[PDB]
């Protein structure tokens, strides 16, 4: 049943991603030859991914990671692409949310599990938007230093209490204050151990009035 | 130890069912997406039709995920319930008012239905969670409307006894087999239909009503109709 809670949570980003592209296609993009095949490709990939997700989360209930060498620039770019589409077909005024990308010009190659790591990126990107009720710009950086590849995601949202910067990675822990709104508290806990499974590190810095920055570090080579 | 056994076995089939039930819309989706990708997107007489179906399968899964989440919070005691003293007469009336309002707008209604109200005349004040309890009434009212003949009457009663507040909602449909009066509240139990409709509604409603300290059950005679009951402890 821990299966049920986890799969319910983790299916939310792909379903939202899937619906956004379907609505874009439905809104008229299906008539447009230079975008429709690309959009359809994303829906096909997200649908297949959700099926891969359902089966594996059920098997875990009975150290299963699929490591491949990946170009993080391209993947993170792909992940952000899905969120851009989400934001363009959302209920909010255009430019109410913005994803700013600041990637290094180098191509960074890292050993990760593509499906499991995507879940991590989805959770944090979801958080950055969801806890930015008054809108905001999300800043996503990608760089390598000291043999580590580092991803950072910054928001102009609500902050995180300094006392709770450690607790946000705990399972079912949610910040107990009021917003301008919250769910289970499973996102960052799940996200943390996937990063730890990949040999990485995750941490957060925040100012309670202006926003937060989450960090992921992965082994380079 | 058949106790812990039955607990562990109910859980295993539920989990299997959730795997199967989430897998099915996605597989349908995959087929439509491949048809579109294989070339149907270029075709104006099928592409819009296909896209709508994919949208519905997606929407249905979102309703499923949300319902699976309500059940998981309930299954863990994470659910936050707020018992407050409210006028049940007025609340039930508002629920019925909103359903009445829907039918009074002519989107060439699929099926015309009538709601007869038989409320007690004393005003009943009770501790409940209005938001969660309203959800239950909608679920039963939706069912009552969905499974009633064309021109049928839905009978909504509110009555009190020394120790119980009783709400009953009756439909004039084909009813429910005596063997399935308990089973209709089980998770994923739905009429044989092989889009929409999860079969989690009454399961959620049973656990919400039980959460509020109440009781829910159904009586039916095949061919004549069904009556659903909600009992809440009075004063
Ligand atoms: N950018 C941000 N700004 C402010 N608070 C944040 C934040 N990112 C996370 N948090 C807080 O830290 C906690 C992280 O827990 P987690 O994200 O697992 O809960 P959750 O899964 O219910 C969020 P969601 O419903 O969007 O998936 C949240 O309760 C949230 O309040
Ligand atoms: N008033 C009624 N009369 C006859 N059968 C009913 C009924 N209410 C429910 N049922 C049957 O019991 C099962 C459980 O109903 P429930 O309302 O939980 O399904 P659901 O969650 O998909 C909402 P809906 O069926 O209105 O879309 C359904 O499959 C339905 O066939």
Residue numbers in the entry:
A (entry chain B): 383 to 444, 450 to 567, 570 to 610
B (entry chain A): 372 to 565, 570 to 610
From the paper:
A typical TCS is composed of a sensor histidine kinase (SK) and a cognate response regulator (RR), which are encoded by genes that are often clustered in the genome. Here, we sought to determine the crystal structures of a WalK homologue, lpWalK from Lactobacillus plantarum, which shares 60% sequence identity in the DHp and CA domains to our previous solved smVicK structure, in different conformations in the presence of ATP analogues or ADP. The catalytic region of lpWalK contains one DHp domain (amino acids 370–450) and one CA domain (amino acids 450–624).
In addition, the γP of ATP was visible when lpWalK was co-crystallized with AMPPCP but not AMPPNP. Together, our data indicate that WalK adopts a closed structure in the presence of ATP analogues or ADP, which is characterized by the asymmetric positioning of the two CA domains; only one monomer of the dimer switches to a closed conformation while the other one remains open. Only one monomer folds into a closed state through an ∼58° rotation, while the other monomer remains open. ATP/ADP fits into the active site of the CA domain through extensive interactions involving the N box and the G1 and G2 loops. We have found that ATP/ADP interacts with His391 in the DHp domain through hydrogen bonds in the closed lpWalK. A magnesium ion was not identified in the ATP/ADP-binding pocket of the closed lpWalK structures. In the open WalK structure the DHp is completely symmetric, with two straight α1 helices, whereas in the closed WalK state it is asymmetric, as characterized by helical bending in one α1 but not the other.
